[PDB]
Design a protein around this ligand. Sequence first.
Ligand SMILES: [Ca+2]
Ligand SMILES: [Ca+2]
Ligand SMILES: [Ca+2]
Ligand SMILES: [Ca+2]
Lengths: 143, 700
Amino acid sequence: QLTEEQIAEFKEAFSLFDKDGDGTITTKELGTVMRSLGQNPTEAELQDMINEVDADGNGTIDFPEFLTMMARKMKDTDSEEEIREAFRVFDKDGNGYISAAELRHVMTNLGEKLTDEEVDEMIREADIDGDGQVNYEEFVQMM
Amino acid sequence: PLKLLTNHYERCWKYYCLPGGWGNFGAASEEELHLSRKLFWGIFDALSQKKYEQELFKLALPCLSAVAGALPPDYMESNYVSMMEKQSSMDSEGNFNPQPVDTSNITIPEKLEYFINKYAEHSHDKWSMDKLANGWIYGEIYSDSSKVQPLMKPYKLLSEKEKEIYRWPIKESLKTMLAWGWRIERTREGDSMALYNGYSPRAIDMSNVTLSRDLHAMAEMMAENYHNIWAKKKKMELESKGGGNHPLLVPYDTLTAKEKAKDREKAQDILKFLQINGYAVSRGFKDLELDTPSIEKRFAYSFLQQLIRYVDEAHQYILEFDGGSRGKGEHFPYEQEIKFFAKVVLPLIDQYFKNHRLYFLSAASRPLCSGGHASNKEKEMVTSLFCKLGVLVRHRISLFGNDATSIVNCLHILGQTLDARTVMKTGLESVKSALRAFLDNAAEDLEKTMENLKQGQFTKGVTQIINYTTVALLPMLSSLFEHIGQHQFGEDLILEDVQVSCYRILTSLYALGTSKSIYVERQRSALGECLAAFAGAFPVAFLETHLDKHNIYSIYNTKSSRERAALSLPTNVEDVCPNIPSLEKLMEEIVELAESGIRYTQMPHVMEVILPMLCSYMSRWWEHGPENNPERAEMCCTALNSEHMNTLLGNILKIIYNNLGIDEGAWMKRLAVFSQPIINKVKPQLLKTHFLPLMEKLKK
Ligand SMILES: [Ca+2]
Ligand SMILES: [Ca+2]
Ligand SMILES: [Ca+2]
Ligand SMILES: [Ca+2]
């Protein structure tokens, strides 16, 4: 039922939590993401989390189990809404087009240390249209 | 292993590509280079004849790209090959076949007998010193309890069979390296010495002797051979015993230093004794010749023929699919080949020509003086691959699984990598005609697009091919013009009948820029940037003909009157480029735009296109005008003055001030982006005292 592109979108999301790449998210592997986002989960909580989703009972979430819980969440159009939401909060300029000038603020916002001149050099290929300022259209192709 | 190889060849690419390599680590010994070339070709062939598995094919392509990047494109393929390669040693069954070299057929020469006897005496001497150090003493009877040995007599009093026990290892150690071919000679020094000619044995404290470094390598190989021999007859003992695997049966490479110690020691002692006798040992092979000028052995040469004919059967397969499109069954065994093409060949081309951008452009002209020489016929076949890719991508968008964008990407970077050495000095006539048939065919293809768009404006096959044209062809030819302009190859690359094709393409683009539609809106950027290329940095003087008649390069003057009147040559500049307005017209147009300032809603494409034009012919001739050289005046194609840029740039930034009020512009940022090169070429301290409005208008 799920779109094959949405399958591929859940591929990359599934591998985002699966750093070791074995296709299984352990409790500690999941825990690292939660701590990276600032939240301190107890080990018992993490087990309760995975157990509810782990139909197999192996203690580690597999992708088919991951898809079933994806279907359980009504994320029908939230993906591009988040992408659209990302585009507007990224465009702090509010012009509907994000300029390399604001790119220096946002690199500090995430915490990335990629150098600014390269960011402009990448934004010359990120902008296939070339606008020198990224719109929603050039935002989606980048995503 | 695929990922391991990818990571290694990405991290240590400088070790292989750069002649210096890593400063601390060094460079390859050419054996690593041979191994890497063999790996690249083996993986490439296996992937070519391998059935498509998605994960395997997505992991193999990065490995191939990394290996190609690491390999020098001018790599020297050694005619010298390796010595009896141990592929069968690491066989699947048993994992270690320790086959040694056969020495029964070979026989040791006679002159070595003096060396044999002296080394046998030396071995017996160290033997005796060792075990009268352990406490063994000469006696008449052999008693183990008292540790007395009748064999403690000197070498002369030793029995004949007692001398043979030393001789046997000596002659096999000589025969294994003689059968290998290694030349052993002995100098006039040793010959003079041989002519000169309870015992207390005093052997040479040989530990202080040291070998040459090649000699260390030779000792290594002969030690590996000795271990293979030992492992061979040990293994025979193992099948006789029916089990009991010895822990030391593992190969020489897997062995540790302690395990290798005795075998190495045997190698060094025998070689050092040979040196101390003065016998001269050397490699078993004579270097015959190195064919450096030959392009055949170039890695880039081999890679390009591989790519060239792969694209060849790819194109004729696409012809077969077009011929079978009349039929019902589109499923063919060639699905494997076309997925291989679209998933490997194009990405490999892209990565290779990204990593080796400098190599194919400058054949060791001045960047990287150590090397980087690309062969001239390699250059012309790079141009041939360019042409053939351009022809192959023509009308195959549906067959391409949305990878047409990747094809255009590879094509335009290959166009950037294009160089004109072949056309200036020596180029194959077939290749020249083929690729410029490509150029002119693109010309009438854009033409037939304009007539079909004027016949039926409705927008199927013709619509998708119009999208193909406005996405690939025009940006492609514009990037062609860009690299020719930046390399200054124009005025001599575009001499004859090419300038006719260029006027044709020029008029076509000009009618495109005067026509308006949704496709024209989509190609607004391509039109603007190609006409840019044209009308301030571009090779020919298509606007100013009044001084072109005096140009030596000028088309009519280069080809006299006979053929000009004969062929399809319109006898006048205004005849060959009719719809083009002159400089007077196209710059009074600029000035009237300046005092007018039309709103973007009515006449948009004019102010969206008209400035970058001026930007890429006008300054071809801002450097080329008399303001740089008072001599060679009136020889110039056209006359253009720093004051002329002063006027036109005043025009453009004033209309930019007018521009900032119309929805702030992604397209006025078009003009800004394409103008930083223009204003950077512009002499800056003009920009000061004239930039005053731009900072308050810019912080707005
Ligand atoms: Ca995992
Ligand atoms: Ca599970
Ligand atoms: Ca903005
Ligand atoms: Ca853009």
